[PDB]
């Protein structure tokens, strides 16, 4: 089965094509991860996935989505990830991390605590920053402060320092969070970027923050470890053909700038959209980005059955299949997929203390 | 659903009727558990089971099954369990432990490393002890040393010391391992016990080691925490009616000795048997023990589907359903069962960072 073929990118070899995409846990305190994350990540890595990308980890305190978000804005924050890196590697998986800045969608409650912007009377909140002083709307009404040129320099340096820390902590795969309506995506989109300086207006200017951040990270991230990004390539806002064409052109520039793989997603920049949710619906879009930009890709949002994942690889729509929620339901989902796809010795997707007995359960 | 009704025994309340029975991991070193066990147990506890009984933990070095078995024969060994106890509790499950002595089945290889008695030239092996100098046979040919009265006194004290260490580590539930052909079971069975002293021959004599060990443990284990045992009530050796009658009588004497619940199993004392493996095959046997000995029971060996578990509880065959291998396959099996049985808010079997999203997946 294609899902269980290894994948090599730079010096990193994944044992199969199953990637666990970044999934915020909202369980950190002051950015510091803890026993929640340690067990959560170690268990999923033992489940068999070849790559585990750690959740959106803020490059700066105001770049957290919520008060429960992980951070990597100090060396002490980075050192807290070391046992997670070690547990993922000990399980035979590859440890990655998504480094992030939530932009105008920051200072929000946890999803099971309202999911909305923290009110001004709640001392847990903080001022948000963005390309322009314009709110997302809906449940995120807080108007962000428009970034200064010094803010732009500072946030870029925060991404550099976050990448340096991720490198030194032993991560073997990095993903820049340029998707999902957060800071990077909001620089690209004309919905959110009304700037009149070098960072807004034209395609070159809207791309500039993302390309400059990529280039700055490229200087500190090892050439032999995959340098990746997540990017929303369309919004389902009635502008899809033009937006996809521009996003694919930006992907070409990412490739020229040393990007090794693109996690293809939806922008989620504004709420006034009509996303056609369905099984594997991103398949054709990821395939178009992969083929037209000539870059390996992953995607998510409905590939979480063994046959859907296998079909996407066979059709050369994806290079890795990201499977998120199914791994929250079952940390050993990779083993479940190996069984369903008839992999020889499927139980040995898991470590010996499980595999021995489940082979004989069979 | 009966499977998701709470259960109270002494001062302990389990949130549902799903118990994870003891399952050796073979990953300890010199009896000390480590990060294998920490993640393994914490992840299963977060999966939703109401009770998690930690694997057979040796009361003495020679009572391990294998060089990978956990031990609790010193205070340092007990302290290693504290983070496991606390992680199970933090997940909302109840931490138990099975304390054990492998008897003539000790000094064996891990199951995926031959599963057989360690060879005499292998430096990892040790001298085994048993009621009588008689080998199990088959893949376990080593002849054990017949225990003296001094050995009997010492092993009993080892069980006492282990129970006191388990108490201080914070376990809320203890299970004495009198099953599966190990030391306790082998004192009961005429196949393995040929003694001519007070500990062999008659039913009273064969029961004596088990009753005296239970009574000695009772003096140090808190009256307000469940005191349980696992015991093989038949062998499938052509002597089932007589053996089950004797085993049920011993269960009555365990109850008179303060036992709160019996984990009903098969003896596995000798290899020359014909065990009729099948779904829920222990149901009728556990029901007979429960009704005739008037004692709460659990059992295992084929209850690991949601409907089989539910049916056994509704028929009053069991008070708790032990589900072992299904939790190695999926450490969130309790959530899978809640979904299959149509429990309201089934996703909230899991902690919020999973439950919130799986409710909406639905
Ligand atoms: C709990 C949760 C947290 C998420 N956090 C992140 C995140 O930190 N970064 C990110 O890029 N996507 C995040 N996402 C989106 C997922 O990576 C993924 O795209 C989504 O779950 C769809 O894939 P699936 O259908 O396999 O679940 C998150 C999704 C969930 C359910
Ligand atoms: C890996 C493994 C380890 C086990 N270790 C123990 C043990 O330490 N003590 C015990 O009493 N039973 C042990 N058993 C037997 C189980 O507790 C249980 O009775 C068996 O797995 C049957 O239940 P199931 O059909 O739900 O798996 C073990 C079983 C397995 C698969
Ligand atoms: C068998 C492979 O798994 C392991 O050894 C492990 N984590 O995966 C540890 C720390 O014991
Ligand atoms: C809905 C698009 O945004 C995401 O997927 C996300 N992070 O990227 C979270 C934490 O929800
Ligand atoms: C029929 C069950 O066989 C097993 O796997 C087992 N436990 O589950 C053993 C041998 O310990
Ligand atoms: C909200 C549930 O969180 C937990 O269960 C936990 N351990 O289990 C923590 C706080 O780390
Ligand atoms: C075959 C019966 O033995 C067991 O289940 C056991 N412990 O009790 C193991 C395999 O470790
Ligand atoms: C509640 C819907 O869950 C999702 O689709 C999701 N990821 O899978 C989000 C919003 O991040």
Numbering used by the authors:
A (entry chain B), B (entry chain A): 2 to 363
Quoted from the paper:
The biocatalytic reduction of the oxime moiety to the corresponding amine group has only recently been found to be a promiscuous activity of ene-reductases transforming α-oximo β-keto esters. By studying the crystal structures of enzyme oxime complexes, analyzing molecular dynamics simulations, and investigating biocatalytic cascades and possible intermediates, we obtained evidence that the reaction proceeds via an imine intermediate and not via the hydroxylamine intermediate. To gain more insight into the reaction pathway, we determined the crystal structures of the two enzymes OPR3 and XenA in complex with the oxime substrates 1a–c, either by co-crystallization or by soaking. All the crystal structures obtained had a high resolution (1.9–1.35 Å) and showed clear electron density features for the oximes.
To assess if the introduced amino acid exchanges affected the overall structure and the binding of the oxime, we also crystallized the tyrosine variants in complex with selected oxime substrates. The protomers in the crystal structures of the tyrosine variants are perfectly superimposable with the ones of the wild-type enzymes, confirming that the exchanges did not lead to major structural alterations. Interestingly, the binding mode of the oxime substrates also did not change in most of the structures. The propanoyl moiety of oxime 1b points into this cavity and is likely stabilized by hydrophobic interactions. Substrates with an acetyl moiety (such as oximes 1a and 1c) give the non-productive binding mode described above. Tyrosine 183, the canonical proton donor of XenA,55 is also found at a hydrogen bond distance from the Cα of the oxime. Looking at the results obtained for XenA, product formation was comparable for both tyrosine variants, the canonical Y183F and the non-canonical one (Y27F). The calculated high Kd for oxime 1b clearly indicates this enzyme’s low affinity for the substrate and might explain why this enzyme performed poorly in the biotransformation of the other oximes in our previous work. Both the Y183F and the Y27F variants of XenA showed a non-Michaelis–Menten behavior, with a linear increase of the rate over the concentration (bottom right).
